[PDB]
Amino acid sequence: KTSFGSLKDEDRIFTNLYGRHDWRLKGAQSRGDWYKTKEILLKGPDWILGEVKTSGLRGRGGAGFPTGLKWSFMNKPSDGRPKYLVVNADEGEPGTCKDREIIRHDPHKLVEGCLVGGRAMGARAAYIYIRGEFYNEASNLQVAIREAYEAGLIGKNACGSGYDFDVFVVRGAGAYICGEETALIESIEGKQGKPRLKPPFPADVGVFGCPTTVANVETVAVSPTICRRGGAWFASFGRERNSGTKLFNISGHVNNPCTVEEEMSVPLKELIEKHAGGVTGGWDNLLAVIPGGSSTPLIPKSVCETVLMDFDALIQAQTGLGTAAVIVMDRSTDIVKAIARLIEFYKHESCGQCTPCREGVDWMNKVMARFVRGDARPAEIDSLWEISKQIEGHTICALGDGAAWPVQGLIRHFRPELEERMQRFAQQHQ
Amino acid sequence: ALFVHRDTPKNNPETPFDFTPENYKRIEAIVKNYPEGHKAAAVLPVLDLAQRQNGWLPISAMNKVAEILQVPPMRVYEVATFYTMYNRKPVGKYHIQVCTTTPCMLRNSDSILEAIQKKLGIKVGETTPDKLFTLIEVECLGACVNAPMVQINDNYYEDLTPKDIEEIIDELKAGKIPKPGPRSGRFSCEPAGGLTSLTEPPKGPGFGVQAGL
Amino acid sequence: GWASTADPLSNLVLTFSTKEDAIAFAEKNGWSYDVEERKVPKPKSKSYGANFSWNKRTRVSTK
Numbered sequence: 001k002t003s004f005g006s007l008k009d010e011d012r013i014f015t016n017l018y019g020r021h022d023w024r025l026k027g028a029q030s031r032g033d034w035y036k037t038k039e040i041l042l043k044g045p046d047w048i049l050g051e052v053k054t055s056g057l058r059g060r061g062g063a064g065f066p067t068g069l070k071w072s073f074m075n076k077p078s079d080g081r082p083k084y085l086v087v088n089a090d091e092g093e094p095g096t097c098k099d100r101e102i103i104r105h106d107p108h109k110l111v112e113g114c115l116v117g118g119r120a121m122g123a124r125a126a127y128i129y130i131r132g133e134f135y136n137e138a139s140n141l142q143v144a145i146r147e148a149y150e151a152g153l154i155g156k157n158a159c160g161s162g163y164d165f166d167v168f169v170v171r172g173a174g175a176y177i178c179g180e181e182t183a184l185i186e187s188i189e190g191k192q193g194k195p196r197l198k199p200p201f202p203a204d205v206g207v208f209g210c211p212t213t214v215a216n217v218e219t220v221a222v223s224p225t226i227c228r229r230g231g232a233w234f235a236s237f238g239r240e241r242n243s244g245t246k247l248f249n250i251s252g253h254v255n256n257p258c259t260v261e262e263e264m265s266v267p268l269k270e271l272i273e274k275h276a277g278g279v280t281g282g283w284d285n286l287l288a289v290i291p292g293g294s295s296t297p298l299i300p301k302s303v304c305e306t307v308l309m310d311f312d313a314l315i316q317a318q319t320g321l322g323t324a325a326v327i328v329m330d331r332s333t334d335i336v337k338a339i340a341r342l343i344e345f346y347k348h349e350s351c352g353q354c355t356p357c358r359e360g361v362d363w364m365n366k367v368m369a370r371f372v373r374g375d376a377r378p379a380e381i382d383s384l385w386e387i388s389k390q391i392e393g394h395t396i397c398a399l400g401d402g403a404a405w406p407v408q409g410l411i412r413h414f415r416p417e418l419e420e421r422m423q424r425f426a427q428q429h430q
Numbered sequence: 431a432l433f434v435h436r437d438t439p440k441n442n443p444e445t446p447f448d449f450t451p452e453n454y455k456r457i458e459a460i461v462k463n464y465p466e467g468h469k470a471a472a473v474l475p476v477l478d479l480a481q482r483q484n485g486w487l488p489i490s491a492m493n494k495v496a497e498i499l500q501v502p503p504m505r506v507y508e509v510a511t512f513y514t515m516y517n518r519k520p521v522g523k524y525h526i527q528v529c530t531t532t533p534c535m536l537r538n539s540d541s542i543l544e545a546i547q548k549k550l551g552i553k554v555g556e557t558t559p560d561k562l563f564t565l566i567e568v569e570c571l572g573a574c575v576n577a578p579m580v581q582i583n584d585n586y587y588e589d590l591t592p593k594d595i596e597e598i599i600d601e602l603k604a605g606k607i608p609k610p611g612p613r614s615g616r617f618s619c620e621p622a623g624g625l626t627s628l629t630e631p632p633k634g635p636g637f638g639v640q641a642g643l
Numbered sequence: 644g645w646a647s648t649a650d651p652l653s654n655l656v657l658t659f660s661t662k663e664d665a666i667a668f669a670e671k672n673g674w675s676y677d678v679e680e681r682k683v684p685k686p687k688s689k690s691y692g693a694n695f696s697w698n699k700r701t702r703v704s705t706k
């Protein structure tokens with residue numbers, strides 16, 4: 001197979017993504033959920049982990065780590081401590097709203113995924129870290145959790161298999177840095193959302209010191225479908241080591257911003273011209289595209305023509321996949337102002353525990369504000385690049401790298417616009 | 431805008447505050463949600479519970495939450511100051527947050543912000559003199575495909591126009607409660623030009639399963 | 644009001660690589676001498692994981 005995309009409705013993972021059907025237990029069980037879960041729980045954690053590993057499912061959070069190996073990290077005998085599975089439902093990344101749609105429209109799929117994942121790694125219970133701002137989503141999730149509890153699917157003797165499994169929902173308090181898995185673990189324990197250092201990994205010391213595995217909503221809710229349809233069914237899509245279907249949130253200067261499921265290795269041009277309704281003012285009006293939300297560098301029109309929206313093609317285009325969040329900027333935009341606002345957002349969401357991010361993000365904010373104003377010298381632009389090289393790779397967590405990447409991409413792709421802006425200011429003001 | 435506290439007559443440890451017995455039962459359930467030996471893990475929602483008791487957090491819910499969980503008060507102070515949801519200043523009855531992040535400013539959220547400013551007659555971060563509306567700006571709230579948007583109390587209002595937000599304001603002033611949903615043609619996240627996907631009905635259980643399961 | 648002294652050896656501090664050479668130099672000039680031993684710091688045991696122990700008392704109250 002060479003042409004990737006044009007996914008039929010028979011292969012979409014998340015039916016009722018648009019909320020047109022019932023989201024409760026009677027609606028979810030009529031769409032295929034909660035079917036033959038007892039045999040899945042009874043077959044074996046080794047079989048479930050092997051089926052996940054053969055499927056080639058990778059990280060849907062944006063890190064790109066393979067899910068099967070990471071889930072099999074905790075497949076070890078216990079030392080007397082309980083084991084925990086935690087679902088990351090914070091989703092503080094700009095441009096990203098797919099997990100909100102999953103927790104608002106398919107909560108029972110998330111609960112069945114929690115049960116299947118907890119069976120796979122022998123977890124004692126499940127914790128869902130919902131976002132604080134998603135109050136209605138959390139209420140709907142807890143309604144579905146109660147409806148699944150009163151049906152005997154979870155709890156004591158879950159799904160009639162003799163395996164106990166408990167589920168919890170914990171609300172956040174408005175912090176994007178709580179989306180990091182170690183900062184999420186620290187936030188559940190009742191401290192500030194300040195990340196830990198690896199090693200020790202969460203598979204050894206996690207929440208409450210117990211072995212704990214943290215996984216995204218989109219990589220948990222697909223696990224019962226992974227077990228039911230089979231590994232090769234998910235491996236049929238995309239390129240090699242890029243299998244699966246992805247939710248894409250397209251927003252920006254676009255006629256119809258929307259969330260849509262598609263194949264992994266679909267070209268970006270086909271997706272943005274088919275599902276998004278096209279760039280405003282035609283294709284020639286397009287100026288830049290950020291393919292993964294605020295964590296990834298942008299790419300101009302010269303790279304956006306024949307780019308495949310998977311991990312390998314995007315990492316070959318000196319950017320990252322991110323959370324498949326397509327932010328589109330046309331020619332009627334102040335691009336430097338947009339990157340300055342992104343950097344100011346990164347300044348307003350940074351825990352401040354470790355020094356290089358805590359100082360360099362503020363320094364980058366001042367430099368980019370002066371660049372938007374234009375009050376600098378041109379060589380300082382190159383100096384700003386060096387500041388990024390003093391942040392990327394010297395931080396506790398990846399928020400500093402996630403702030404250094406868009407500045408590097410903006411400089412590397414639109415240095416002429418920056419320098420012409422500031423020399424125009426220098427001419428017209430001095 | 432200050433991360434340190436000074437003793438005022440309206441904000442001191444001697445300010446009276448207490449939990450209702452139903453809220454005590456809720457706090458007990460929240461504590462029982464966590465493993466034994468880790469009572470401090472209940473400090474995150476319970477303090478937020480106190481916010482729902484008052485609308486803002488003086489330093490009397492801080493000490494009370496520290497007392498009823500056997501934690502030092504400075505941990506509660508750290509938790510309240512680190513997180514932006516916990517209002518340590520008395521906000522208005524309807525807290526309005528406007529998203530000014532790049533995928534929201536791309537769809538001209540500045541016009542909506544200026545419409546709110548010229549309607550309520552306030553500034554950024556200022557409180558209306560009838561103690562009803564508070565207007566601040568925050569980061570991305572997860573409604574990027576329905577940008578621009580606002581968040582009033584615990585209700586999302588997405589795909590807004592200046593006419594839409596001024597209608598929301600003058601209907602909120604009348605005592606009623608608006609509809610927490612997008613105000614465009616689409617309902618939640620579908621494209622406005624019809625369903626580009628999931629036009630076919632779902633296929634139900636027992637579809638595409640493998641042998642041996 | 645300065646510090647007026649009458650001791651000529653108050654600003655005489657000598658440096659030696661090893662203890663026995665300093666002992667020989669002390670015995671050579673006829674000075675009555677006393678020796679304090681080298682207080683080496685003991686090798687501590689440090690672990691980052693012990694701050695997040697499941698049941699031990701060495702948990703960090705804040706971070």
Ligand SMILES: NC(=O)C1=CN([C@@H]2O[C@H](COP(=O)(O)OP(=O)(O)OC[C@H]3O[C@@H](n4cnc5c(N)ncnc54)[C@H](O)[C@@H]3O)[C@@H](O)[C@H]2O)C=CC1
Pocket residue numbers: 059060061062063064065070091092093096179181201202214295296320322323398402
């Ligand atoms: N999904 C979202 O909303 C957001 C996602 N991101 C993305 O998240 C990523 C940064 O997060 P991380 O989880 O720190 O990424 P990655 O460096 O750590 O690691 C991915 C997973 O593998 C594990 N791991 C890493 N190194 C390991 C090792 N040597 N041995 C065993 N396990 C190991 C980690 O614990 C984690 O569970 C970036 O790619 C960033 O773009 C960033 C912002 C928001």
Ligand SMILES: Cc1cc2nc3c(=O)[nH]c(=O)nc-3n(C[C@H](O)[C@H](O)[C@H](O)COP(=O)(O)O)c2cc1C
Pocket residue numbers: 058059060061062063064065066067088089090091092093176177178179180181214215216217219397398399
């Ligand atoms: C600063 C920062 C914020 C993050 N926020 C989220 C988030 O909100 N939601 C999420 O699923 N992952 C987030 N992540 C990624 C997680 O560290 C981790 O990759 C994810 O929770 C699970 O990855 P997985 O898809 O392989 O299961 C964030 C990472 C960083 C560095």
Ligand code: SF4
Pocket residue numbers: 177194195349350351352353354355357358395396397398399400
């Ligand atoms: S990089 Fe920034 S957000 Fe991450 S641990 Fe360091 S200070 Fe905190």
Ligand code: FES
Pocket residue numbers: 093094095096529530531532533534569570571572573574577579
């Ligand atoms: S950028 Fe405004 S809701 Fe995400």
